[PDB]
């Protein structure tokens, strides 16, 4: 087999300086590269690491058309909701996984990077919608949520609320209220050729035998 070369951009995803708010989660498409998943699955850094529809023992010798890395910041208590068939404000209104998801959820605590004294209010989540998200939908709408029966004028007031809250990430928050950075890897196969594959191992070359 040829030299291991053109390794996938997981460093650009996992070691980005700036992450998204969970209501406006970023998606990166990974394609046409060698994915060594070993640098993820046997890293001790992650607090959560688990996969659905695949064992990590069967990564590194599977091929896919595309991989999507979706990424955002949430409370450490909410990482619970980033799984198939869950419910709560994050699963219902911010980021929904399919029930038949094939992919991995990875998370790590980040209160050294993106918490500060007096709070880091730069991260937000939807607190309200008229309905739940469907799988892999995003909603960046800002329109004032009319919560009660009274027709709202399109501005904040009684029974009519601004739809996003902000996280109060103090560095002294208890572990469930700390920030966590999350990456969700979603794997797909189409009738297009596979472009993302695990690294091919090679033996030595022996001659005259």
């Amino acid at each position: 087999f040829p030299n291991i070369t053109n390794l996938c951009p997981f460093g650009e995803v996992f070691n980005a300086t700036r992450f998204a708010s969970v209501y406006a989660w970023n998606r990166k498409r990974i394609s046409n590269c060698v994915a060594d998943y070993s640098v993820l699955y046997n890293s001790a850094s992650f607090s959560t690491f688990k996969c659905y529809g695949v064992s990590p023992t069967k990564l590194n010798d599977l091929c896919f058309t595309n991989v999507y890395a979706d990424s955002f910041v949430i409370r450490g208590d909410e990482v619970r909701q980033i799984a198939p068939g869950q419910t709560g404000k994050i699963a219902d209104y911010n980021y929904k996984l399919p029930d038949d998801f094939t992919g991995c959820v990875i998370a790590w605590n980040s209160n050294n990077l993106d918490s500060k004294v007096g709070g880091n209010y730069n991260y937000l989540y939807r607190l309200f919608r008229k309905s739940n998200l469907k799988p892999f939908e995003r909603d960046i709408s800002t329109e004032i949520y009319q919560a009660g029966s009274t027709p709202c004028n399109g501005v904040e007031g009684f029974n009519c609320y601004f739809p996003l809250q902000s996280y109060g990430f103090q560095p002294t928050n208890g572990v469930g209220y700390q920030p966590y950075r999350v990456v969700v890897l979603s794997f797909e196969l189409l009738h297009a050729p596979a472009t993302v594959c695990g690294p091919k191992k090679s033996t030595n070359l022996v001659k005259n035998k």
């Epitope: 070993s38 699955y41 690491f49 688990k50 990590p56 023992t57 990482v79």
Partner: antibody, heavy 118, light 111 residues
């Protein structure tokens, strides 16, 4: 296919040093996680420590102060020293393999009974 | 810090179904995979569940695993007991670079 075979002195007395060896047949160290695990008489399993893929040690913080794990790659062989033993170190000791960091203990050595008694 | 706890013993008559619980504490059990091992007396353990739901090749479909992120609990179900199922059962997981085992449950098949 892969087999773990272990040996060492089982009968010891207090303040000696335990020294167990485990050897791998039908396979090799480099890609996998290798651990020592113990089971006191009539009690549950306790993980002592490991060698990761490529050979760095990690230890259970409760035993880290007096334990040493090392690989002799020339023999596909690795060992546990556990120093200044007490009667509480009396257990069956197993070497075991794990395929990746958070995976199952997929292969186990045959065990070795250690009795610490004056 | 993180700990798994199990009942000391469980029993039912042959042909019935039993569930063995495994409860997490000082952390959340759903964050990493859970394994279950069977240990028959005087021998090394063997895995019967190897990721939360997943059963090894050569293990009977009578054994099934589950997990519950609301109860902070895993469980092992053995369904249609045989007298050969009588053994210790241990749950296990990873946290904070330590491998943690539950205290073990003796299953007796009530003969």
């Amino acid at each position: 296919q892969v087999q773990l075979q272990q040996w060492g002195a089982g009968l010891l007395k207090p303040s000696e040093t335990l020294s167990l060896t485990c050897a791998v047949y039908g396979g090799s160290f480099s890609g996998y996680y290798w651990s020592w695990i113990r089971q006191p008489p009539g009690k549950g399993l306790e993980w002592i420590g490991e060698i990761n893929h490529s050979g760095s040690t990690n230890y259970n913080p409760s035993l880290k102060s007096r334990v040493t794990i090392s690989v002799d790659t020339s023999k596909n062989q690795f060992s546990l020293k556990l120093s200044s033993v007490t009667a509480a170190d009396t257990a069956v000791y197993y070497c075991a393999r794990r395929w990746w960091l958070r995976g199952a203990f997929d292969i186990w050595g045959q065990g070795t009974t250690v009795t610490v008694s004056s | 810090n993180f700990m798994l706890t199990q009942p000391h013993s469980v029993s039912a008559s042959p042909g019935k179904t039993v569930t063995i619980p495994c409860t997490g504490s000082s952390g959340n059990i759903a964050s990493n995979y859970v394994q279950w091992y069977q240990q028959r007396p005087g021998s090394a353990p063997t895995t019967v569940i190897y990721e939360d739901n997943q059963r090894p090749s050569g293990v009977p479909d009578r054994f099934s695993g589950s997990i519950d992120s609301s109860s902070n609990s895993a469980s092992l179900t053995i369904s249609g007991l045989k007298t050969e199922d009588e053994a210790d059962y241990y749950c296990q997981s990873y946290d904070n670079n330590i491998q943690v085992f539950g205290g073990g449950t003796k299953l007796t098949v009530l003969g």
